[PDB]
Protein backbone atom coordinates (compact mmCIF):
# COMPACT_ATOMS: atom_id res chain seq x y z
CA UNK A 1 0.00 0.00 0.00
CA UNK A 2 1.56 3.25 -1.25
CA UNK A 3 0.53 6.87 -0.76
CA UNK A 4 1.13 9.99 -2.85
CA UNK A 5 0.83 12.32 0.17
CA UNK A 6 0.70 12.03 3.94
CA UNK A 7 -0.63 14.37 6.62
CA UNK A 8 0.97 14.77 10.05
CA UNK A 9 0.82 17.47 12.74
CA UNK A 10 -1.28 19.68 10.45
CA UNK A 11 1.16 19.57 7.51
CA UNK A 12 0.75 17.65 4.25
CA UNK A 13 3.86 16.22 2.58
CA UNK A 14 4.05 15.17 -1.06
CA UNK A 15 6.64 13.14 -2.97
CA UNK A 16 9.98 14.48 -4.22
CA UNK A 17 10.20 17.28 -1.65
CA UNK A 18 12.94 17.80 0.97
CA UNK A 19 12.10 17.44 4.65
CA UNK A 20 13.90 17.78 7.97
CA UNK A 21 13.86 14.71 10.21
CA UNK A 22 14.56 14.28 13.92
CA UNK A 23 17.97 12.57 14.05
CA UNK A 24 18.63 9.13 15.48
CA UNK A 25 21.43 10.32 17.74
CA UNK A 26 20.45 13.33 19.84
CA UNK A 27 23.79 15.09 19.26
CA UNK A 28 23.26 15.00 15.48
CA UNK A 29 21.92 17.88 13.44
CA UNK A 30 18.43 17.42 11.97
CA UNK A 31 18.64 15.14 8.95
CA UNK A 32 17.63 16.34 5.48
CA UNK A 33 16.04 13.90 3.05
CA UNK A 34 14.04 13.80 -0.17
CA UNK A 35 10.77 11.86 0.09
CA UNK A 36 10.77 9.04 -2.48
CA UNK A 37 7.90 6.84 -1.26
CA UNK A 38 5.11 6.85 1.32
CA UNK A 39 4.10 3.36 2.45
CA UNK A 40 2.09 1.74 5.25
CA UNK A 41 3.60 -1.21 7.15
CA UNK A 42 1.74 -4.47 8.01
CA UNK A 43 1.21 -3.22 11.60
CA UNK A 44 -0.24 0.11 10.33
CA UNK A 45 2.67 2.45 11.04
CA UNK A 46 3.38 4.90 8.20
CA UNK A 47 6.96 4.87 6.91
CA UNK A 48 8.52 7.17 4.32
CA UNK A 49 11.45 6.27 2.09
CA UNK A 50 13.97 9.07 2.20
CA UNK A 51 17.00 9.82 0.04
CA UNK A 52 19.61 11.37 2.32
CA UNK A 53 21.59 14.57 1.96
CA UNK A 54 25.08 14.62 3.43
CA UNK A 55 26.64 17.62 5.09
CA UNK A 56 30.18 18.19 3.74
CA UNK A 57 31.74 17.73 7.20
CA UNK A 58 30.11 14.31 7.75
CA UNK A 59 30.61 12.79 4.29
CA UNK A 60 33.67 10.55 4.40
CA UNK A 61 36.40 11.38 1.83
CA UNK A 62 38.30 8.45 0.24
CA UNK A 63 41.51 9.75 1.87
CA UNK A 64 39.73 9.47 5.29
CA UNK A 65 39.20 13.20 5.87
CA UNK A 66 36.13 15.43 5.45
CA UNK A 67 35.24 18.13 2.88
CA UNK A 68 35.16 21.87 3.61
CA UNK A 69 31.72 23.39 2.94
CA UNK A 70 32.23 26.27 0.53
CA UNK A 71 28.99 27.91 1.76
CA UNK A 72 27.03 27.40 4.96
CA UNK A 73 24.10 26.39 2.77
CA UNK A 74 26.01 23.59 1.02
CA UNK A 75 24.64 20.05 1.12
CA UNK A 76 25.65 16.90 -0.73
CA UNK A 77 22.89 14.83 -2.25
CA UNK A 78 23.26 11.06 -2.52
CA UNK A 79 21.45 7.85 -3.41
CA UNK A 80 21.51 6.42 0.12
CA UNK A 81 17.90 5.55 0.95
CA UNK A 82 16.30 4.52 4.24
CA UNK A 83 12.82 3.83 5.59
CA UNK A 84 12.12 6.24 8.45
CA UNK A 85 8.87 6.72 10.41
CA UNK A 86 6.50 9.39 9.13
CA UNK A 87 6.17 10.87 12.63
CA UNK A 88 9.89 11.75 12.50
CA UNK A 89 9.35 14.66 10.08
CA UNK A 90 9.69 18.17 11.50
CA UNK A 91 8.70 20.34 8.51
CA UNK A 92 9.37 20.83 4.81
CA UNK A 93 12.55 22.74 4.03
CA UNK A 94 14.08 24.31 0.90
CA UNK A 95 16.89 22.69 -1.12
CA UNK A 96 18.22 24.26 -4.34
CA UNK A 97 19.99 22.16 -6.98
CA UNK A 98 21.95 24.81 -8.95
CA UNK A 99 24.24 23.66 -11.83
CA UNK A 100 27.86 24.70 -12.18
CA UNK A 101 27.15 27.35 -14.83
CA UNK A 102 24.54 29.24 -12.81
CA UNK A 103 25.61 30.89 -9.56
CA UNK A 104 23.92 30.61 -6.18
CA UNK A 105 20.78 32.56 -5.25
CA UNK A 106 21.06 35.36 -2.72
CA UNK A 107 20.55 34.56 0.95
CA UNK A 108 17.95 37.20 1.83
CA UNK A 109 16.00 36.43 -1.36
CA UNK A 110 15.59 32.63 -1.09
CA UNK A 111 17.04 31.12 2.10
CA UNK A 112 17.66 27.40 2.20
CA UNK A 113 20.12 24.66 1.37
CA UNK A 114 22.05 24.63 -1.91
CA UNK A 115 23.39 21.51 -3.64
CA UNK A 116 26.29 21.50 -6.10
CA UNK A 117 27.57 17.93 -5.56
CA UNK A 118 26.27 14.39 -5.09
CA UNK A 119 28.05 12.14 -2.60
CA UNK A 120 29.14 8.69 -3.80
CA UNK A 121 29.01 6.61 -0.62
CA UNK A 122 30.50 3.48 -2.22
CA UNK A 123 33.66 5.12 -3.56
CA UNK A 124 33.42 8.07 -1.13
CA UNK A 125 33.68 10.71 -3.92
CA UNK A 126 31.67 13.71 -5.29
CA UNK A 127 29.84 13.76 -8.63
CA UNK A 128 28.75 16.97 -10.34
CA UNK A 129 25.08 17.47 -11.20
CA UNK A 130 25.87 16.46 -14.80
CA UNK A 131 28.45 13.69 -15.06
CA UNK A 132 29.29 10.72 -17.26
CA UNK A 133 29.86 8.53 -14.19
CA UNK A 134 26.10 8.51 -13.56
CA UNK A 135 23.89 5.74 -14.82
CA UNK A 136 20.91 6.76 -16.95
CA UNK A 137 18.39 6.65 -14.10
CA UNK A 138 20.59 8.50 -11.59
CA UNK A 139 21.38 11.24 -14.10
CA UNK A 140 17.62 11.40 -14.73
CA UNK A 141 17.00 11.86 -10.99
CA UNK A 142 19.56 14.67 -10.76
CA UNK A 143 18.10 16.31 -13.88
CA UNK A 144 14.58 16.11 -12.42
CA UNK A 145 15.78 17.83 -9.25
CA UNK A 146 17.68 20.51 -11.20
CA UNK A 147 14.57 21.12 -13.32
CA UNK A 148 12.36 21.42 -10.23
CA UNK A 149 14.84 23.95 -8.85
CA UNK A 150 14.79 25.84 -12.16
CA UNK A 151 10.99 26.12 -12.26
CA UNK A 152 11.28 28.00 -8.95
CA UNK A 153 14.33 30.16 -9.75
CA UNK A 154 13.75 31.67 -13.17
CA UNK A 155 16.74 33.98 -13.53
CA UNK A 156 20.15 32.36 -14.19
CA UNK A 157 22.88 34.79 -13.09
CA UNK A 158 25.98 33.12 -14.69
CA UNK A 159 29.45 33.60 -13.10
Amino acid sequence: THFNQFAYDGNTYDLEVPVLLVPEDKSQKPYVAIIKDITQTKDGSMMILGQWFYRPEEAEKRGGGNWQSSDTRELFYSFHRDEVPAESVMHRCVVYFVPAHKQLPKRKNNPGFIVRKVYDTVEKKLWKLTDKDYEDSKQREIDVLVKKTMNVLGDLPDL
Partner: peptide, 12 residues
Amino acid sequence: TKAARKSAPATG
Protein backbone atom coordinates in the same frame (compact mmCIF):
# COMPACT_ATOMS: atom_id res chain seq x y z
CA THR B 1 7.29 11.94 17.43
CA LYS B 2 9.63 9.07 16.59
CA ALA B 3 13.22 9.61 15.43
CA ALA B 4 14.74 8.63 12.08
CA ARG B 5 17.67 6.14 12.04
CA LYS B 6 20.26 6.16 9.22
CA SER B 7 21.68 2.86 7.98
CA ALA B 8 25.43 2.36 7.34
CA PRO B 9 25.92 1.21 3.72
CA ALA B 10 28.73 -0.98 2.44
CA THR B 11 31.52 1.21 1.05
CA GLY B 12 34.80 0.66 -0.75
